[PDB]
Amino acid sequence: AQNPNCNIMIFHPTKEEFNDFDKYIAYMESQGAHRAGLAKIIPPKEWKARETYDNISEILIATPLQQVASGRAGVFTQYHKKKKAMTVGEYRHLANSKKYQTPPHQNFEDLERKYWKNRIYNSPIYGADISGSLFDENTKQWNLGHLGTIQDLLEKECGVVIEGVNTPYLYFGMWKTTFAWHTEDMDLYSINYLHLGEPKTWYVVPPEHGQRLERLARELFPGSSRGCGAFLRHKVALISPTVLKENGIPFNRITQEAGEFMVTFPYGYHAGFNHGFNCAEAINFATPRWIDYGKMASQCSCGEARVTFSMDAFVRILQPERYDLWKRGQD
């Protein structure tokens, strides 16, 4: 069995190996990459996502989110308070202000220490889930706006034609902006490209150990657990590496820098934070190996998780028994 300790693997494809996306994903899995839940892909040196980022300031963040924390430093929830619209140029200036900017630090480890010590005492503003792309249309390799769609994968594998579309999303971050512990909708893959700016630190639990994280989360967030049998789908709960180590949960960590891709694999729980002003692009995708994970994915039916139009069909075809109750949650 390849990668039996479930370490995060890092890949350096050549320009020739960068042509066929599906084939490279299947290669990475042949080497065991999926066992970690997360992999890093460093693009060939010849490749570029676009020529420059000099003209992005007029993108609108229509609903910036202020991430307000509650709890203790290592075990907290966050709620998202909606703020007034602002441009990317305005958001960048805000990120760089004395109130919100990255503090002085020695290296990524010192910054990680400061994040876990101090996150709860501040409320950084995140521009999340903005439909759009920063890949140039002429970029033919690993262009997250030109991937094969999940609806077409389900059709190729299972023969059933369904409605829905699959498009990318932009994330504009600042120091302390936080992504809570989650897997993807329907336990899909994700791919994330850091277009510009400061790094993003990731934490991940191997898929084969995801239920260990779920059981800890039910202990640590006991009212949320009683409210919903899949409450990590709400994307609000944080648990620090120190707490995970104290409770024996297997995990790994890695820092993504500008110019690098990360892939999350089906049922790989992940969480993390941004080091300073940055812009990432991400999208979900599927392969043949995902289909069995989709059939088994938990669902939020309490009504909190409220998700895309396209997830309807996935539930309807892969989880017909749940369909009824899950749709009660979504209406």
Ligand X SMILES: O=C(O)CNC(=O)C(=O)O
Contact 116, 74 (CB under 8 A): yes
| Cα–Cα distance measured from residue 44 to residue 40, given in angstroms and rounded to the nearest whole number | 13
Q: Which does 188 bind (CB under 5 to 8 A by kind): Zn ion, Ni ion, ligand X, none?
A: none
Q: Which does 111 bind (CB under 5 to 8 A by kind): ligand X, Zn ion, Ni ion, none?
A: none
Contact 262, 38 (CB under 8 A): yes
| Cα–Cα distance measured from residue 215 to residue 3, given in angstroms and rounded to the nearest whole number | 25
From candidates 291, 302, 307, 317, binder to Zn ion by CB under 5 A:
302
Q: Which does 300 bind (CB under 5 to 8 A by kind): ligand X, Zn ion, Ni ion, none?
A: Zn ion
Residues of the binding site for 2-oxoglutarate = 126, 192, 200, 235
Question: For ligand X, which is the closer residue by CB, 161 or 256?
Answer: 256
Question: For tokens 């997360």, what's the residue?
Answer: 38
Q: Which parts of 49-108 interact with Mg ion (CB under 5 A)?
A: 56, 58
Q: Which two tokens stand for residue 255?
A: 């820092």
SS3 call for 251: coil
| Cα–Cα distance measured from residue 179 to residue 273, given in angstroms and rounded to the nearest whole number | 6
Question: For Ni ion, which is the closer residue by CB, 100 or 202?
Answer: 202
Question: For Ni ion, which is the closer residue by CB, 86 or 236?
Answer: 236
Nearest to 38 by CA among 49, 29, 47: 29
In the chain, which residues are last before a break of more than 2.5 Å from C to the next N?
none
Nearest to 128 by CA among 93, 179, 79: 179
From candidates 192, 240, 298, 299, binder to ligand X by CB under 6 A:
192
Q: Which does 58 bind (CB under 5 to 8 A by kind): Ni ion, Mg ion, ligand X, none?
A: Mg ion
Nearest to 253 by CA among 234, 240, 236, 267: 240
Letters for 225-254 (x = contact with Zn ion by CB under 5 A, - = none) are ---x--------------------------
Q: Which does 192 bind (CB under 5 to 8 A by kind): Ni ion, ligand X, Mg ion, none?
A: ligand X
Question: For ligand X, which is the closer residue by CB, 120 or 282?
Answer: 282
Q: Which does 228 bind (CB under 5 to 8 A by kind): Ni ion, ligand X, Zn ion, none?
A: Zn ion
| Cα–Cα distance measured from residue 101 to residue 129, given in angstroms and rounded to the nearest whole number | 22
Phi, psi of 82 (to 5 degrees): -70, 135
Single out the segment in contact with Ni ion by CB under 5 A; choices: 108-116, 168-176, 187-195, 203-211.
187-195
User: Which DSSP letter does residue 142 get?
Assistant: S
- By CB under 6 A, how many residues form the interface with ligand X? 8
From candidates 41, 239, 280, 311, binder to ligand X by CB under 6 A:
280
Question: For Ni ion, which is the closer residue by CB, 190 or 256?
Answer: 190
From candidates 141, 264, 287, 310, binder to ligand X by CB under 6 A:
264
Question: For Ni ion, which is the closer residue by CB, 67 or 190?
Answer: 190
C-alpha pair distances (Å), 184 with each of 136, 239, 286, 307: 26, 18, 11, 11
Letters for 138-177 (x = contact with ligand X by CB under 6 A, - = none) are ---------------------------------x------
Q: Which secondary structure element, helix H or strand E, spans residue 93, and what is its range?
A: helix 88-95
| Cα–Cα distance measured from residue 194 to residue 306, given in angstroms and rounded to the nearest whole number | 26
Q: Would you tell me which residues interact with Zn ion (CB under 5 A)?
A: 228, 300, 302, 304
Q: Would you tell me which residues interact with ligand X (CB under 6 A)?
A: 171, 179, 190, 192, 264, 270, 280, 282
Q: Would you tell me which residues interact with Mg ion (CB under 5 A)?
A: 56, 58
